[PDB]
RNA sequence: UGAAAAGCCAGUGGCGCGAAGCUACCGUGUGCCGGAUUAUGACUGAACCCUCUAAGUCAGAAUCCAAGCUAGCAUGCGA
């Protein structure tokens, strides 16, 4: 069965400006800008604050669609920590 | 064929060598660049910490499609 409304929201810290333009998310911080297209997802992204929140919800979704809500949140969270702290992977030489 | 010289007949008289042309892995020369992917291994990532999968991505082949090569009266078309 389809739930009427499944929603998940998240915080957006200051010094980071998030822009939503028809499922295109741009995140800008000290380290630069990051962009993710989400037009493949079928949800709606609403800032619902002074740019300090972001709520993503699906209407009449099945269990597969609501799985995308947490996926989208974590992807957008990745853009925030990418432009505030960056990412670093350490590889080791084994021989 | 009177001899000699010069030939001719024996359906190519026979033998030796024989250019030209044709021709032999029996001789010589040449034979090919990009994209998408299979299998599989991975990235990120929920569902539900994890997870190559659900959404979204990567690498990938004597493979496929191109390119190249042959034709092109395709009742096609340009200058
Ligand atoms: K010859
Ligand atoms: Mg004589
Ligand atoms: Mg006679
Ligand atoms: Mg004889
Ligand atoms: Mg040969
Ligand atoms: Mg994983
Ligand atoms: Mg696969
Ligand atoms: Mg590839």
Automatic annotation (TrEMBL):
One of its GO terms (cellular component) is ribonucleoprotein complex. The chain holds residues 1 to 95 of 189 of the full protein. Residues 12-86 form the Large ribosomal subunit protein uL6 alpha-beta domain. Keywords: Ribonucleoprotein, Ribosomal protein. GO terms for biological process: translation. This is Large ribosomal subunit protein uL6 alpha-beta domain-containing protein. GO terms for molecular function: rRNA binding; structural constituent of ribosome. Belongs to the universal ribosomal protein uL6 family.
